[PDB]
Amino acid sequence: MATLLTTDDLRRALVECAGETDGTDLSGDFLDLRFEDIGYDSLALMETAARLESRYGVSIPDDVAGRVDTPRELLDLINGALAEAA
């Protein structure tokens, strides 16, 4: 359905917040427990994503993205937003 952004892309966007970290299982997956693992409630990461998209150029989906509980959701969010943007 979409193939604009990539999983590795969301990774970098999330590293900007925490570059250094000796606690991450990046040898199999990082979505099964990314938002739940760290303390990133939908109320904290909300504004964080609001600015993260300011550079993307795509629309401003703060509602659906604001209530993002899982990490993989954020990726599929900006992705579909870019496809429709064009």
Q: Domain extents for the chain?
A: 1-86
Joined tokens for residue 80: 């579909």
3-state secondary structure 6-28: CHHHHHHHHHCCCCCCCCCCCCC
Tell me the CATH number of domain 1-86, given options 3.40.47.10, 3.40.190.10, 3.40.50.300, 1.10.1200.10: 1.10.1200.10
DSSP per-residue codes, 47-69: HHHHHHTTTT-S---HHHHHT--
Q: Measuring CA to CA, which residue among 1, 6, 2 is closest to residue 75?
A: 6
Are 65 and 74 in contact by the 8 Å Cβ rule? The answer is yes
Joined tokens for residue 28: 């199999």
DSSP for residue 3: -
Tell me the C-alpha distance between 41 and 68, whole Å.
Answer: 8
Tell me the C-alpha distance between 77 and 68, whole Å.
Answer: 9
Experimental determination technique: NMR
Residue 34: which residues within 8 A CB-CB, separation 6 or more? 14, 40, 70, 71
